[PDB]
Amino acid sequence: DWNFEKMGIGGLDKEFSDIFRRAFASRVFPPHVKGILLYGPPGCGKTLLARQIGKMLNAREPKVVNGPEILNKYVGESEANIRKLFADAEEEQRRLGANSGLHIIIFDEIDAICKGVHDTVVNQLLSKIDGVEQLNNILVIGMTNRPDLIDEALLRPGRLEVKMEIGLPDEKGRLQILHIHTARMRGHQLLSADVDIKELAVETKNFSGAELEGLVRAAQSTAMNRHIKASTKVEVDMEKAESLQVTRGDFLASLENDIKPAFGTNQEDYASYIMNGIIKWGDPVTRVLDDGELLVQQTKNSDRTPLVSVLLEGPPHSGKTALAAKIAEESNFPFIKICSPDKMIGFSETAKCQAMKKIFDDAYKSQLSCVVVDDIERLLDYVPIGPRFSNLVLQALLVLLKKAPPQGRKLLIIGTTSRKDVLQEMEMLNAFSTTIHVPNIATGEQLLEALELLGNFKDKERTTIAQQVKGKKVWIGIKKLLMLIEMSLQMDPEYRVRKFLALLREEGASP
Amino acid sequence: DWNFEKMGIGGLDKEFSDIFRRAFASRVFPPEIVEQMGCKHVKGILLYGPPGCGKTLLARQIGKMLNAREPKVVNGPEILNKYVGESEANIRKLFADAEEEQRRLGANSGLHIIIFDEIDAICKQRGSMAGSTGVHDTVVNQLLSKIDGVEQLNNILVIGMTNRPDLIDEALLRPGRLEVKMEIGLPDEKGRLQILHIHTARMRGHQLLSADV
Amino acid sequence: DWNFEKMGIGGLDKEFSDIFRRAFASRVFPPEIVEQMGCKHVKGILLYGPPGCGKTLLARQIGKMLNAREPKVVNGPEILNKYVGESEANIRKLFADAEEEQRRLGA
Amino acid sequence: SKQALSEIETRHSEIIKLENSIRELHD
Amino acid sequence: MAEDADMRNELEEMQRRADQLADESLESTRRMLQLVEESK
Ligand SMILES: Nc1ncnc2c1ncn2[C@@H]1O[C@H](COP(=O)(O)OP(=O)(O)OP(=O)(O)O)[C@@H](O)[C@H]1O
Ligand SMILES: Nc1ncnc2c1ncn2[C@@H]1O[C@H](COP(=O)(O)OP(=O)(O)OP(=O)(O)O)[C@@H](O)[C@H]1O
Ligand SMILES: Nc1ncnc2c1ncn2[C@@H]1O[C@H](COP(=O)(O)OP(=O)(O)OP(=O)(O)O)[C@@H](O)[C@H]1O
Ligand SMILES: Nc1ncnc2c1ncn2[C@@H]1O[C@H](COP(=O)(O)OP(=O)(O)OP(=O)(O)O)[C@@H](O)[C@H]1O
């Protein structure tokens, strides 16, 4: 049949239709091709198609041979063996000529036939199939998993014409396979109603078919084992298991620990650069974000300024990278990436140059994009002694900052640092188009608002803190504020406020 | 005539339970229920772990637990032979009885055990290796084809153990051929207590041990 | 007829005492107590050190101190061979009489 | 295989038997 | 550059073809023919 689902296979409707259109169209057509090969990853049904094609055509029973079985120690027996194998159709061709049936030969694991002895055996088969006497009643189907280890000569035209392929099933194919292998369960009512096949099809990814069957078998096994007690002497529910109903829990368990996939996946870490969100502890944050939005719209709309850059400056422990990430996510450009020194530990200068070049090469392809670079001074490692740093990465940056992208494309660049004077000394402060400033907490009112937003000290403690602080100014970074709060939250309720004030005084300084 | 205490494995109490759950449940329930289920029995177990953990003990005890004929052990790479095309015959001679019986008694036959040992001495990556005359690739292909081929066999169980799984070839580790992949490992205080108790039982039973231990 | 002063080794008292304690102590006690205790004998020894100290002498003397079959001495890499699967056939020949006699005479 | 060599040997054993038979006839 | 140290080789023989029995068979058959001719 041409249904492709009656015989117990799914996921390759188009390939089956191609097989029908290309291979056997001539035979069906009112009154040829003599080479077929199959190759695909392990799993997805190949032997099934072999057996089905064996019983499909109104042809004689196919012969099944092995891969490494055509051999023998005594020179002479292998040649006689192949001769015996191929002797079947000779008599039929002799006695019936053109008006003869079709012969199907199945070679299993043919990859072991091509590699001295292997040369002669491949030559014998090669001559027999495509030699002086052309037989139009012989068809050979071979299958492998590693086509790389096959000879080119075996694949020339006139010998192996049709070269199909198999592939990992899609969601529809997985649903078809699950239907096929749960048909019996549904027919005998042994499957519970709470199970939802759509959820399983959505959840499972790239199981290549065989793993789906394994998962179904594992779920059956666990549902079967729930109704058996073994220790002293094996015993089973007997009658009570006659109503054994599988549950969603079994398909859950069989998926999370066993029946794992044979392939991998990827991971993302974009959540690591914001851990406490953003709180409006003061006016300047809104100003910074509004300026970022203006820059984003400027890069989006302009036509004769394709490249735009900005610099974020602020004393240490002032959350510059957090604002950089937030402004990056606000724009919602198609392509966004963050180049940070955390990945590159122990690298030389050349590796850093290559990494930056790769990131920018990726960024150039898309239409419009934005890139952010954080902690420049650590990227081109800097030490006040000497000073000392790298002169290759610096030039790479100074060149990449004023290189226009391909025609009709847009790139935005943001940079964050905490040492502006040094950058102005190296002359890199000229490249950037404009700069923005990130301040520190200055007035006690902003501090009190910050504590109120954090919600860690109550009205009495807050009043005491206000009395002790309103007559003073402050200079503190938000990250350090969180650290100090955590440090002072470790004492008993009696010493918390006094400890916090003591720590603030100890770290208390002026700009 | 069996009892979990008779084998004498200490510190591996959940691994054996998992193996019994996932490999021998199908063969114990009434045939009619299984036939209604239409499931196929597993045909492979793989074990690995650092030296001196209990793998071979598990294999021996599993072989002794069941019924029918005793297993057929293959000590390391004792299959290789110098004559051309003679290793394949030695590989194919192992499955002769299984093939014959499955052909003769349909789906009401006994059980045959095959215990491969130091499996990584034969089954290396097909494309790997160098020009060693190519015998190893032909061995791997023959084993792969015979374990699960066009002709179907469903009354054999194969156990394999090793010390470095990553060198086995992928085409062998897929559901159907060798599914369960355990990992025997170092014990913990409870396992250490169980092992110490196991190995000192008879001394306690014959009054050969002092009261201060 | 054995006596420690006959074998002629000097400066290796403690080492020999330790080896005799760990290795040949199981096989000298009356069998009944060993069976009751239920233990398996030790089947290995490794000797190492700098050149010229007395390893091979100890091995040879241990060879001429027991009442059993003569040792099978292997001189370096005697067991390699050019053909395929002929080193393994050489190795398996050493553990040949042991297996058959174990299966024949039990314990 | 060695089976071929054994088959040749049996062939020749039968030939020797025929040799003896014909020698007896001539005698 | 890195020069490969050299190489080492492994061997795998094959069955021999004595084909010497057929000679004895042929000699025997010729003797058959001689005796058969004489008997007539
Ligand atoms: N799409 C599918 N439809 C039906 N059965 C499938 C499908 N995918 C996998 N299977 C199951 O997996 C196996 C199909 O693979 P098969 O036995 O033909 O081996 P193969 O992967 O082609 O061979 P090899 O090990 O040589 O690569 C059977 O158990 C079949 O039940
Ligand atoms: N309004 C805010 N502005 C900035 N960061 C904030 C704000 N509210 C909360 N945070 C949190 O404060 C932390 C800021 O630490 P971050 O590492 O960004 O500081 P930094 O001074 O830019 O860094 P570095 O000193 O390592 O260059 C982040 O957890 C951020 O989520
Ligand atoms: N879990 C265990 N419980 C009881 N005895 C154990 C256990 N593990 C090891 N033993 C003891 O150690 C020996 C068994 O070693 P085993 O054959 O399992 O080693 P292995 O890991 O297969 O070694 P190798 O890697 O060298 O082949 C026996 O003495 C057995 O009593
Ligand atoms: N304890 C000893 N008492 C008496 N003679 C000794 C002693 N140790 C070594 N010798 C002398 O030195 C020789 C040591 O030879 P032996 O083979 O033990 O050296 P080795 O360390 O095994 O050799 P290699 O350096 O190749 O390892 C003996 O033959 C003997 O003459």
DSSP A267-325: ---TTTT-SS-----STHHHHHHHHHHHHHHHHHH-SS--EEEEEEE--SSS-HHHHHH
B119: number of Cβ within 10 Å: 24
The strand pairing partners of B180, in sequence order, are B45
Identify residue A307 by its one-letter amino acid code: L
Which positions in chain E have a beta carbon within 8 angstroms of at least one beta carbon in chain A? 14-15, 17
Which residue's alpha carbon is at the smallest distance from atom 1 of ligand 4?
C10
Q: Do D26 and E39 touch (CB under 8 A)?
A: yes
Residue of A360, A286, A356 lying closest to A326 (CA atoms): A286
B52 touches chain C (CB under 8 A): no
Tell me which of A378, A479, A482 to substitute to probe ligand 2's pocket, judged by most ligand atoms within 8 Å of the beta carbon.
A479
Residue of B6, B8, B193, B209 lying closest to C36 (CA atoms): B209
Read off the tokens for B155: 């009354």
Which residue's alpha carbon is at the smallest distance from atom 18 of ligand 4?
C54
Are B156 and B95 in contact by the 8 Å Cβ rule? The answer is: yes
Are A113 and A67 in contact by the 8 Å Cβ rule? The answer is: yes
Q: Look at phi and psi of residue B106 and say left if phi exceeds 0, alpha if psi is from -120 to 50, else beta.
A: left
Helix (H) or strand (E) holding A236: strand A235-236
- Name the phi and psi angles at A350, rounded to 5: -60, -40
Are A462 and A448 in contact by the 8 Å Cβ rule? The answer is: yes
Stated length of chain D: 27
The strand pairing partners of A426, in sequence order, are none
A267: number of Cβ within 10 Å: 5
Chain B positions touching A228 (Cβ under 8 A) are 25, 28-29
**Closest chain B C-alpha to A184 CA, distance in angstroms:** 7
The strand pairing partners of A104, in sequence order, are A139
Residues 6+ apart with CB under 8 A from A437: A313, A314
Strands A138-144 and B72-74, how do they pair? unpaired
Helices (H), A23-76: 25-28, 47-56
D7 touches chain E (CB under 8 A): no
Read off the tokens for E20: 């010497």
Give the Cα separation of D3 and D6 in Å (integer). Answer: 5
Q: Do chains C and D touch (3 or more CB pairs under 8 A)?
A: no
Method by which this entry was solved: cryo-EM
Residue of B50, B58, B74 lying closest to B23 (CA atoms): B58
Residue of A82, A89, A38, A93 lying closest to A62 (CA atoms): A89
Are A38 and A144 in contact by the 8 Å Cβ rule? The answer is: yes
What DSSP line would sit under C86-106, residue for residue? -HHHHHHHHTSHHHHHHHHH-
Q: Is the CB of A479 under 6 A from ligand 2?
A: yes
- Atom of ligand 4 minimally distant from the CA of C49: 21
Read off the tokens for C88: 């393994």
Residue ranges lining ligand 1, Cβ < 6 Å: A 8-11, 42-48, 145, 169, 177, 209-210, 213; B 171, 176
Residue of A215, A302, A209 lying closest to A8 (CA atoms): A209
Helix, strand and coil in chain C, % to nearest 5: 45, 0, 55
A511: number of Cβ within 10 Å: 8
CA angle (D10 as vertex; D7, D16 as ends), nearest 5: 145
Give the Cα separation of C94 and C76 in Å (integer). Answer: 15
Residue of A nearest to E14 (CA): A73
- The position carrying tokens 């060198």 is B167
Residues 6+ apart with CB under 8 A from D12: E21, E24, E25, E28
A470 carries an active-site annotation: no
Read off the tokens for A265: 């996946």
Residue of B42, B168, B146, B19 lying closest to A214 (CA atoms): B42
Helix (H) or strand (E) holding B4: helix B4-7
Number of residue pairs across A and E with CB atoms under 8 Å? 7
The strand pairing partners of A312, in sequence order, are A416, A436
Q: Do chains E and D touch (3 or more CB pairs under 8 A)?
A: yes
Chain C positions touching E10 (Cβ under 8 A) are 82, 84
To 10 degrees, what angle do helices A349-365 and A391-400 make? 10
Identify residue C99 by its one-letter amino acid code: E
Give the Cα separation of A418 and A438 in Å (integer). Answer: 10
The strand pairing partners of A131, in sequence order, are none
A451: number of Cβ within 10 Å: 19
Are D4 and E16 in contact by the 8 Å Cβ rule? The answer is: no
Tell me which of A478, A480, A481, A486 to substitute to probe ligand 2's pocket, judged by most ligand atoms within 8 Å of the beta carbon.
A478
Residue A179 marked in a binding site: no
Give the Cα separation of B23 and B37 in Å (integer). Answer: 16
Are E14 and B83 in contact by the 8 Å Cβ rule? The answer is: yes
**Per-residue CA distances from D10 to A348, C95, D15 (Å):** 78, 38, 9
- Atom of ligand 1 minimally distant from the CA of A209: 8
- The position carrying tokens 């799914």 is A10
Are A280 and A323 in contact by the 8 Å Cβ rule? The answer is: no
Residue A415 marked in a binding site: no
Residue A334 marked in a binding site: no
Q: Do B82 and E15 touch (CB under 8 A)?
A: no
Are A508 and A349 in contact by the 8 Å Cβ rule? The answer is: no
A240 carries an active-site annotation: no
List subunits contacting chain A, requiring 3 or more Cβ pairs under 8 Å. Answer: B, D, E
DSSP, res A43: S
| C-alpha count within 13 angstroms, C-beta hemisphere, residue A416 | 24
What DSSP line would sit under A399-427, residue for residue? HHTT---STT-EEEEEEEES-HHHHHHHT
| Residue C6: burial class (beta carbons within 10 Å; 0-12, 13-18, 19+) | exposed
Give the Cα separation of A409 and A299 in Å (integer). Answer: 10
Long-range contacts (CB closer than 8 Å, 24 or more residues apart) made by A171-174: A171/A201, A171/A202, A172/A10, A172/A11, A173/A10, A173/A11, A173/A12, A173/A209, A174/A11, A174/A201, A174/A204, A174/A207, A174/A212
Give the Cα separation of B55 and B57 in Å (integer). Answer: 5
- Name the phi and psi angles at A431, rounded to 5: -65, -45
Residues 6+ apart with CB under 8 A from B180: A258, B18, B19, B22, B23, B42, B44, B45, B46
Long-range contacts (CB closer than 8 Å, 24 or more residues apart) made by A281-288: A281/A441, A281/A446, A281/A449, A281/A450, A281/A453, A281/A478, A282/A439, A282/A441, A282/A446, A282/A449, A284/A438, A284/A439, A285/A323, A288/A323, A288/A436, A288/A438
Which residue's alpha carbon is at the smallest distance from atom 25 of ligand 4?
C51
DSSP, res D1: -
Residues 6+ apart with CB under 8 A from A123: none
Q: Do B3 and A232 touch (CB under 8 A)?
A: yes
Residues 6+ apart with CB under 8 A from B93: none
Which residue's alpha carbon is at the smallest distance from atom 27 of ligand 3?
B51
What is the distance in A from the centroid of ligand 1 to the CA of D20? 63
Identify residue A291 by its one-letter amino acid code: D
Chain D positions touching A74 (Cβ under 8 A) are 1-2, 4
Are A155 and A129 in contact by the 8 Å Cβ rule? The answer is: no
Helix, strand and coil in chain E, % to nearest 5: 50, 0, 50
Q: Is the CB of B43 under 6 A from ligand 3?
A: no
Give the Cα separation of A466 and B200 in Å (integer). Answer: 72
Q: Is the CB of B55 under 6 A from ligand 3?
A: yes
Give the Cα separation of B91 and B85 in Å (integer). Answer: 11
Residue A2 marked in a binding site: no
Are E12 and B82 in contact by the 8 Å Cβ rule? The answer is: yes
Chain D positions touching E36 (Cβ under 8 A) are 22
- CA B69 to the chain's CA centroid: 15
Which residue's alpha carbon is at the smallest distance from atom 3 of ligand 2?
A319
Give the Cα separation of A38 and A34 in Å (integer). Answer: 14
Q: What is the CA radius of gyration of chain B?
A: 20
Residue A493 marked in a binding site: no
Stated length of chain E: 40
Catalytic residue among A320, A326, A352, A410: A320
Read off the tokens for A390: 């790298």
Read off the tokens for A239: 């009658």
Residue of B nearest to A234 (CA): B28
3-state secondary structure labels for all residues of A314-344: CCCCCCHHHHHHHHHHHHCCCEEEEECCCCC
- Name the phi and psi angles at B43, rounded to 5: -135, 45
